[PDB]
Ligand binder design. Structure first.
Ligand SMILES: Nc1ccn([C@H]2C[C@H](O)[C@@H](COP(=O)(O)OP(=O)(O)OP(=O)(O)O)O2)c(=O)n1
Ligand SMILES: [Mg+2]
Ligand SMILES: [Mg+2]
Ligand code: NA
Length: 326
DNA sequence: CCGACGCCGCATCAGC
DNA sequence: GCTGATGCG
DNA sequence: GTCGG
């Protein structure tokens, strides 16, 4: 929290460029600068001191000087005053409403939470569920609740078939004291890069977690990725727990280590790592790391038997999950 | 300068 | 129906 | 918005 004022400012600027300007590279520029400053271990005293970090350049340096001198940023104070930008920024907080849909709703005069509740008929299925649980999805999940959720999911998966392996990833696996959601990596030996020997491998899991009333809603669902909603059971007379976002991803078993590296994140860590892979002549996705040829075309999957094997290919010292929260 | 910026699953739609 | 682009996560 | 070549 040494430079929390600066990194908050940059995050608000990034969200502006994404939601309002629809300028995804500016959004990623601000996010990379906020990330490098957040892990900088001194209280920043000038914009020139910050410009020495990679991803902080002239414009952000000038913004850091304005912020340190005055405690404010005029650019943001004006953005905070513009109704259209403010309304667009708000609507994108609903899961399933991105910047395009948010600008379209505002064009049609749908600009508040009351406006969305009134116009449910204009929402697709995902947006409908995101509105339903808007308040709950804003809350963080204490690690102690993630531990009980973990216990439910792993035990219910064992009951379907003892050969499934379920691994909680995301910020939970990086050791966070609270999470935005539950991310679950799933494997089963009948599903590899070579063959799919059983159908419905993810369906069966979803159905079982629905049957015991853990999963309560579905945002999207295919053969390998489920995005939905879940809730801890409460006790007699106790207030219900908040509803929570749950993401489940079935990865070919022989590609576990690429998949667990991806699903552990953080998103900025993955971005930095994948960009560094490119500079080193490889491409990394959640399935494989492959070399790039002279023509820039990905070649065939390199062999991988651990998370560290991937770090080794691109000549990075290994970083434990807890050190990947960028 | 200025091109490149990580990578992909699912939902939806246009065009056929 | 399928294919490809687009939005969203 | 930033940066490497
Ligand atoms: N743009 C993104 C977003 C996510 N992910 C990967 C890394 C994340 O860790 C993982 C799960 O994404 P989440 O949105 O669930 O984020 P986290 O679990 O890291 O954090 P939170 O505590 O906010 O859920 O997916 C990624 O590679 N690129
Ligand atoms: Mg998560
Ligand atoms: Mg998630
Ligand atoms: Na949204």
């Amino acid at each position: 929290t040494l430079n929390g004022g600066i990194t908050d400012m940059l995050t608000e600027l990034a969200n502006f460029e994404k939601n309002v300007s629809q300028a995804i590279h500016k959004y990623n520029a601000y996010r990379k600068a906020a990330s490098v400053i957040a892990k900088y271990p001194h209280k920043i005293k000038s914009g020139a001191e910050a410009k020495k970090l990679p991803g902080v350049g002239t414009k952000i340096a000038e913004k850091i000087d304005e912020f340190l001198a005055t405690g404010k940023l005029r650019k943001l104070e004006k953005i905070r005053q513009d109704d259209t930008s403010s309304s667009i920024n708000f609507l994108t907080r609903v899961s399933g409403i991105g910047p395009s849909a948010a600008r379209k709703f505002v064009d049609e005069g749908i600009k508040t939470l009351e406006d969305l509740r009134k116009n449910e008929d204009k929402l697709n299925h995902h947006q409908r569920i995101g509105l339903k649980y808007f308040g709950d999805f804003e809350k963080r999940i204490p690690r102690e609740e993630m531990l009980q959720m973990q216990d439910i999911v792993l035990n219910e998966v064992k009951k379907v078939d003892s050969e499934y392996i379920a691994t909680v990833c995301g910020s939970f696996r990086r050791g966070a004291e609270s999470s935005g959601d539950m991310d679950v990596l799933l494997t089963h030996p009948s599903f590899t890069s070579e063959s799919t020997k059983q159908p419905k491998l993810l369906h069966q899991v979803v159905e079982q977690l629905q049957k015991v009333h853990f999963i309560t809603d579905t945002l999207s669902k295919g053969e390998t990725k489920f995005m939905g909603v879940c809730q801890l059971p409460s006790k007699n007379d106790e207030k219900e727990y908040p509803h929570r976002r749950i993401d489940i991803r079935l990865i070919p078993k022989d590609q576990y280590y690429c998949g667990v590296l991806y699903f552990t994140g953080s998103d900025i860590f993955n971005k930095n790592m994948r960009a560094h892979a490119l500079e080193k002549g490889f491409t990394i996705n959640e399935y494989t790391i492959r070399p790039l040829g002279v023509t820039g075309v990905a070649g065939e999957p390199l062999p991988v038997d651990s998370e560290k094997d991937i770090f080794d290919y691109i000549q990075w010292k290994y970083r434990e999950p807890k050190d990947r929260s960028e």
